Amino acid sequence: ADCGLRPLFEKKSLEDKTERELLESYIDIVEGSDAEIGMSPWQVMLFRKSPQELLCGASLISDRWVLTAAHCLLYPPWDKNFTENDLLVRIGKHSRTRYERNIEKISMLEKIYIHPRYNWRENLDRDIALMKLKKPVAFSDYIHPVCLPDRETAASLLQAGYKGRVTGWGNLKETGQPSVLQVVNLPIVERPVCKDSTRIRITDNMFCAGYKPDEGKRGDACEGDSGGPFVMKSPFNNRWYQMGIVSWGEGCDRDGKYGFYTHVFRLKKWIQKVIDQFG
């Protein structure tokens, strides 16, 4: 309900640096920026208990719920299939390596919910999963849920050329690692370009994002950024909406190559469905 209003900006009537770019495309990480403190209070770390390592990115939609990629939990081709005892979710972080003493909170998972029809055998269609936290988290200036779009929010922001923003602790290069969360603002590309760019069968639970080889700007998510959110700020009620989930790509910031993201809106119903059956 308080979704998408960052306590250290919107709340205080402060604007972070690249917000303008976002908002000026509505017509008013590889090669990304260092995030500002409290700029993405809904960003989660998906952390492995042993080895103690970061597996993916994620979002905080509720005080009890996290949104990630299905592929984070379960990928048979790679012998990946995690259970809610092999993980710890870290909320309120900035630096990637250190245990930020009194700023971050670490939770245990209560149940994992993969999309019944996630298609790990062909194209990662429906790459979405929900985790429900053992106990609710308290919001602080650094921990705060993002909003989930509605048919008319998804309607009007989700368009070719609109900038959205990606965030992650992942690879800074294909063949680099940050000390601090990174950010990158990328434009939504039309379907046709998305299609003609790869051999994989593009579905509607998908959208692609990146610049063309020709706009003189690069940027992409990369290794370790999975599950993290692709967000947009409605110029209407200026709240942040989670529009996509980092799904798949071909390389990292490869010319004439774009990012594919789960269409959060398209699967919103399944997400309702699971929150009020067992949440």
């Binding site: 208990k49 042993s50 103690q52 710890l88 390596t97 245990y99 245990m108 690692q177």
Partner: peptide, 10 residues
């Protein structure tokens, strides 16, 4: 590379 976490968390 990771600082250890509250051993109380595993």
């Amino acid at each position: 590379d990771f600082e250890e976490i509250p051993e109380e968390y595993l």
